């Protein structure tokens, strides 16, 4: 159902997030909270940025 009245706020509601990039797919009903930095291409980023 629509939940605009509480969740949304002006200027950007950044409380809830999502994984834009993952190394693999997801098994059903599996919760991932690793939130670890992901590297693409030549995966050279062993650091932070």
């Amino acid at each position, epitope marked *: 159902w*629509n939940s*605009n*009245n*509480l969740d949304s*706020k*002006v*200027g950007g509601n950044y409380n809830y997030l999502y994984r834009l990039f993952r190394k693999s797919n997801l098994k059903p009903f599996e919760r991932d909270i690793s939130t670890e930095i992901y590297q693409a291409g030549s995966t050279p980023c062993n650091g932070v940025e």
Partner: antibody
Framework: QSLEESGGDLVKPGASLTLTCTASGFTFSRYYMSWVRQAPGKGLQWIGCIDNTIDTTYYASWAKGRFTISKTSSTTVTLQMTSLSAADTATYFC?????????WGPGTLVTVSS | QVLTQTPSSVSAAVGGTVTINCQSSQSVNNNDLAWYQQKPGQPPKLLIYFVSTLPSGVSSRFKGSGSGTQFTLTISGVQCDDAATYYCQGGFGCNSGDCTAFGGGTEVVVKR
């Protein structure tokens, strides 16, 4: 983040007119939009609104069939008007949102006279 | 579908609390009422939305009450710069009583 309207000019009654508000810094495909009018000596009233999926259906009851709203491209939305009357004189603001709005453009007045 | 702004005109002082009543003919859709302050010659600015939730970047003086058919706005004080007409933007369960509506103006004057 800004909006700017265009197309306000003196036009005889019964002639079609094209209005247009353009979005700067963002595209009219994520943020809700609305079309509103404010007469110089009368309250504010809304006419049309469309964003994302086809949403043009929502129109004012008094507006009837002479009011249509369509976005020509991603950043510009045009307004088409028919059957102009002396009671249609008002200031046209490009609202941003159906029930809640953040910021509008300066507003282009469209006066109707013969 | 037309929302009545009772009273149409409201007068208050700088340190005097401000109240206003906006009544809706029909029940609103899931608390979708909004409020905008329309300074003359310029489109209105947001002050309170969803009855009571405060937008980001506005003064901490506007608080809203009521739900369903009756709603009200309460302002703790005025810094003489809030002289504008307030429009209670009534979201409706759309396709019934139009799809949304705007009420009448309610400007606040300050006597000095």
């Amino acid at each position: 983040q800004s909006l700017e309207e265009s197309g306000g000019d003196l036009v005889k009654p019964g002639a079609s007119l094209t209005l247009t508000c353009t979005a700067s810094g963002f595209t009219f495909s994520r943020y809700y939009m609305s079309w509103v009018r404010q007469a110089p000596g009368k309250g504010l009233q809304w006419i049309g609104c469309i964003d994302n999926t086809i949403d043009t259906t929502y129109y004012a009851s008094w507006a009837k069939g002479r009011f249509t709203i369509s976005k020509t491209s991603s950043t510009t939305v045009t307004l088409q008007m028919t059957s102009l009357s002396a009671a249609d004189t008002a200031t046209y603001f490009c609202a941003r949102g159906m029930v809640v709005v953040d910021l509008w453009g300066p507003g282009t007045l469209v006066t109707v006279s013969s | 579908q037309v929302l009545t702004q009772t009273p149409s005109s409201v007068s208050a002082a700088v340190g005097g609390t401000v109240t206003i009543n906006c009544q809706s003919s029909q029940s609103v859709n899931n608390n979708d009422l909004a409020w905008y302050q329309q300074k003359p010659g310029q489109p209105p600015k947001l002050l309170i939305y969803f009855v009571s939730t405060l937008p980001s970047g506005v003064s901490s003086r506007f608080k809203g009450s009521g739900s369903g058919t009756q709603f009200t706005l309460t302002i703790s004080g005025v810094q003489c710069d809030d002289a504008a007409t307030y429009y209670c933007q009534g979201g409706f369960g759309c396709n019934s009583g139009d799809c949304t509506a705007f009420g009448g103006g309610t400007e606040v004057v300050v006597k000095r």
